[PDB]
Design a protein around this ligand. Structure first.
Ligand code: PLC
Ligand code: PLC
Ligand code: PLC
Ligand code: PLC
Ligand code: PLC
Ligand code: CL
Ligand code: CL
Ligand code: CL
Ligand code: CL
Ligand code: CL
Ligand code: CL
Ligand code: CL
Ligand code: NA
Ligand code: NA
Ligand code: NA
Ligand code: NA
Ligand code: NA
Lengths: 311, 311, 311, 311, 311
């Protein structure tokens, strides 16, 4: 089999569509997601044209091996898609309608700057390489782009699945290449981060601040060092669910800042004890009373500054 | 090969059945389960009809490639099922009996609201897409729906395996699609959660309340902060076995509430020490004695409220 | 190809054998094990009879596609076995000798009641479904059942590999099925559990009992709460190597009971401190001296009771 | 099919190119990375030559099975590459242009000596074996070596992708082998190691040094032992992301050295308490005051020495 | 195709060779390693002999399907090897030279008795099963046994790769079997265990011994119990990298022994406090001073005894 010949000099237009059946395994560390979808293809092959009046048949069904099919690939996949052809239909004018169901693991970079209050645009890039006989170009049939109502991505809200209708046509290894960008817009369900990480992390921090109502150095050291260790555990827990980024994330910034608050609380607890031992408790009392206001106030203002810089 | 032609204008009815051989790997985080089963299919193909007297046989055995077979797929699977055809049998009137053994990884959302005292309805969605030539509709042969007695799903009780007999017929890319819902009802074996997570979590909480019978601030700080850290460990352990949900789970609610009890216990221990240092122990004694009753009473009432809201 | 025809009315007997080459990956949580073995099959097919004089050869060698082969499957496997045909030898009367080497992941439930001093009976269920032309039945050739001397299952002792010679013949979806039960008897190597979990767990418990020779409340709180946390770590470690069971395991029972001992030790340490603060140390001394005997004695008797109930 | 015959006695030159489409999963522990790329091959086959005039075609397309194709393999791959032929074009003189898209898991050793401020040279070794008919040699077509602009390796910066143009020709199992070295130069994005591991590790160390402004032995023991345990947690965290090396890494060196600082801080805290109990506090005060300067100064100088030895 | 016929009554000798290209993933827990190698085979097939002066061709290249090839398998593999035939060459006398490149996951038991200062002998067992026509025996072509210079097994030193030239010929299920033992001798790179596990474990133990220079019971309890918990963390870390063994490992023995030292240190700290409370400090002073010498001396002698028993 060979490509359909051009009537004049025009490129062969392959109309495409992706209909999402399943979305699963959005892996933040790997920056991948798995997809199960319909891939629809349509192009004109005049060699396959027939008369509907004398044939009595409106459509002809072909097997993939019987006819020429464009070699359509995904750019951002781990391995080649696992595909099963569903149907091939030919209209009397020779317009071919191809439908396959496929599954693939897609590589799509994620922006973690606003994590866990982040939104993402996942991409599925469709591509075709031109043949020596003729140039193949891709198009979007909007009537064949969509998603099943039941499509759920655990921990995410699916906003939209659209295609950038204009392909990116470019030369690659002395041939033309036609690339389409299918975009799946999602927003993270931040809900569970509040009772599981944010509030427990705030509770232990506020517990360290009870040391500002205590003159017992031994108890103070226990309060601030124990809660610091619990903060380290939350830091480790959070960084296991995330890849290493060449930038600060919102959560990373707060987690890092809270260390400074633990460090300054240890200085305060040390300074307080040192002065009491030096028979200067009136002074220690002034620093401790100031700390009761300063620590929550600086914590609030630093969080307003951070929220402003990130959102 | 082409689909059986209609005698009048009727859709082709494909009778289906699923017989479960094995159920394994119910993954709560992934919201998947693996299944090994028989898939049975039956439909009328008049072109295959024969006379028993002339042929000298009452049944005809074909190879899948020799005859037309409907393209039946699963909606909610990760990848296409691993299937091996067991038998194809044709009766004199062209009634085809198809049997395959398959294995598949199924995606099925789970409701964790009542975890670990939850029940689930797992779904296996069977689907067929119509051809230009004719409309294909699915039906349930109840005589061919079932499960092996030895079918066990580790950590779960299997209640029933039934099929919703009327298919969900709908249009998908200008073609009729016929979808059947096979339902596997299961209930979680909550037993092990009692000695492994619930009771250890209650013991450490009750140990933190021994601080209400102690005037030693340094010992009190050690009691409440150490048990809090152990509570954080149980919180982390529990959340590793569960996905992130946009709602509160029963366990999540109790775990979160217990933080409030640790937080208020630290306030009490702080207030008690502060008053003692200020030479007001009579008062501190009133707050501590009230706390001995208030903490277990508020804990019991808050748990009754939570159990009521969730069950 | 079709099944061999009956001389009278008898079912076709397929003689079977399994020879274990490798046993590996006994996964307690998944209740699976991997196996690499020889599967031998033997049946008479008179349509394959030949004269050694005419054909020259005394035994004919065939390719699986060239002749009829019974569709033998495993019941309790995750996916269909990975098999490679080693030989298909046909003797002049038409007796077929089939040999394949296969690998499979087998689902076999485990009884954890006596863990880590437990024994198991792993099963490999062989099955064949009858066809329309004739009924197929399975048999065991004991001369072809066995295991390689070097077969080792890490963490287990292999006792025996035998087959229940009588098949379980039953009706399934209006056809006969013939099932054979191959049994691999194993016993767990409990050795490593003694220095890694049992003795460390006993040491930390005995360390908490040093609080019965101390009047220092703050040291006592540190002794009992710190060792409790280490006990929680061992509880978590043990439960990661085990599935969730709807029954108590021997280890689970001991681990759970040790929490009660930590809980009562905290009560004792609290009661002791309370009385000494109330200027009643004579009494506190009576409770502490009694505890020195009561705690090890009740611990010994409770362990004798538990060992009796479980073994 | 057989290899192209030599016009004189020359070896057959196979021109190669690798164009990277995707780079992912650089696993430090496994010392592997996954790659998705184009592999281009070019060689002259006189037997496939044609005249453009009498053929009416300027180029001829073939199926891989129709013509002779060199058996090109990768040396440093886990399993054989997953490849799909994209195009095979033949020019009039019989110059074959082969293009395949492949995916492979590549084994490439990593030098962790300067971790996390390390750079690596990943290798993809292309190989061909000679045949008895003729010697097959590899060459690099620099015009067909490159990478997509969007190629990103999470946690790394991609510097260059070049090929060593001169192949390594050598004998292997009495046949000559022609090997090409494709080099992907990368540098680690050390950014995230600063707020997640380096600064938290420095904060806990500086917190242990507050013991040099405290006379409370009980508090000092708590400060140094608690932060040491947190240092152990960071040591364990770091070693989980790295393989075991027969040399010291930069991070490993610092982590190990910080133990010495904790060990000497415990000696100081012990010596201080011992002297105070022995009624020699003036002396203990001299050691503690010296320690306030000595510990940060020796820490700075030891880090300058280490940075010098490693960079 | 059928096996080559014997000239007299001799078994068919299949000469073998394994040339290692890659060695990776030595998994201690699983007792497996992955291998990528050349497998070479050689045997005489007289039915394939040809005249060298008449034919003009000195060697004939065949496709695997065109000729008879012995069914060579690996005994100790998880799944059948992934193999790709590289070349098949026939010399005038009919000597066949077969070469394939394969990858396999090999099961090979490991002796952990001297861990992490252990050496191992990994095995690759080659096997052939005889046919009814004739007996097939294996031999080693030492010229075709070897390994690439770049073969590296992360965390190990590769000493030698040799073959036991005499096969193990035995009867299995009424046919002869010919087995060859290929041995890969390796020694563990123990280097990293010294700064990561051994020295940190010794530091925390020596820190517990500072309690012998302290009269503060509350500080002593904190020193011994905190370091014990850190020892438990190292015990757990070590046992995660190792399988469960029915014997003691060298590391396991030291780790277990160090618990006894923590247990006796707690007794000493308890006895010391008890005597001081009983107004017997002169005595407590004698026990504490003796402990300062006894603990390091008994630790040294116990380690000399252990090193002697294990090495
Ligand atoms: C300790 C720090 C606590 C974290 C504070 C919330 C962060 C924040 O301010 O989050 C803000 C995000 C909403 O952001 P958005 O619409 O996605 O951003 C795009 C914004 N544009 C369009 C202006 C650029 O979430 C919320 O709805 C806040 C609910 C979380 C409450 C947490 C309580 C504890
Ligand atoms: C601290 C919190 C303690 C947890 C208390 C158990 C929660 C509960 O009360 O759970 C209740 C569930 C039963 O629920 P059900 O029949 O599925 O609900 C459907 C209810 N409808 C039909 C009314 C809607 O389990 C039990 O039988 C409780 C046994 C667990 C005992 C734990 C002891 C500790
Ligand atoms: C704290 C609790 C400590 C655990 C005590 C061992 C449990 C036990 O007594 O285990 C008993 C099992 C033997 O059991 P068996 O013959 O397989 O059982 C089948 C019994 N029938 C046939 C009679 C029904 O192991 C042993 O040989 C004991 C060695 C372990 C010593 C651990 C010392 C610490
Ligand atoms: C406690 C120890 C603190 C760690 C100090 C940084 C390590 C270092 O000095 O890192 C040095 C590397 C740069 O090295 P380079 O270009 O890879 O080396 C090649 C060098 N030649 C060409 C001379 C051979 O990183 C940096 O840019 C330093 C930024 C990290 C700051 C961390 C602040 C906390
Ligand atoms: C606390 C215990 C500390 C561990 C002591 C080392 C164990 C040992 O003595 O290890 C010995 C092995 C050498 O072993 P080999 O020659 O393979 O043994 C085979 C012996 N035959 C042939 C006699 C049977 O390692 C070494 O070279 C020691 C370097 C490790 C230093 C660790 C310092 C801390
Ligand atoms: Cl693709
Ligand atoms: Cl499917
Ligand atoms: Cl509709
Ligand atoms: Cl329709
Ligand atoms: Cl099977
Ligand atoms: Cl390859
Ligand atoms: Cl093999
Ligand atoms: Na085609
Ligand atoms: Na068909
Ligand atoms: Na067959
Ligand atoms: Na070829
Ligand atoms: Na062959």
């Amino acid at each position: 089999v060979s490509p359909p010949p051009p009537i004049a000099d025009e490129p062969l237009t392959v109309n495409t569509g992706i209909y999402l059946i399943e979305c699963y395994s959005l892996d933040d560390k790997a920056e991948t997601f798995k997809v199960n979808a319909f891939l629809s293809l349509s192009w004109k092959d005049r060699r396959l044209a027939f008369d509907p009046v004398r044939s009595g048949v409106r459509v002809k069904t072909y097997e993939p091996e019987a006819i020429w099919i464009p070699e359509i690939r995904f750019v951002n996949v781990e391995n080649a898609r696992d595909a099963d052809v569903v149907d091939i239909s030919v209209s009397p004018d020779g317009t071919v309608q191809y439908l396959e169901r496929f599954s693939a693991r897609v590589l799509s970079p994620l922006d973690f700057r606003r994590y866990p209050f982040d939104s993402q645009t996942l991409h599925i890039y469709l591509i075709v390489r031109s043949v020596d006989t003729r140039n193949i170009v891709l198009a979007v049939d909007l009537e064949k782009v969509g998603k099943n109502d039941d499509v759920f991505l655990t921990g995410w809200d699916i906003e939209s699945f659209t295609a950038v209708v204009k392909p990116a046509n470019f030369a690659l290894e002395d041939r033309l290449e036609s690339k389409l960008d299918y975009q799946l817009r999602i927003s993270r369900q931040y809900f569970s981060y509040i009772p599981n990480i944010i509030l427990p992390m705030l509770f232990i921090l506020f517990i360290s601040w009870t040391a500002f109502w205590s003159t017992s150095y031994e108890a103070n050291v226990t309060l601030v060092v124990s809660t610091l260790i619990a903060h380290i555990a939350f830091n480790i827990l959070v960084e296991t669910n995330l890849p290493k980024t060449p930038y600060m994330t919102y959560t990373g910034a707060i987690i890092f800042m809270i260390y400074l608050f633990y460090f300054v609380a240890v200085i305060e607890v040390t300074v307080q004890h040192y002065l009491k031992v030096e028979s200067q408790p009136a002074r220690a009392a002034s620093i401790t009373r100031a700390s009761r206001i300063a620590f929550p106030v600086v914590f609030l203002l630093a969080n307003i500054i951070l929220a402003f810089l990130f959102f």
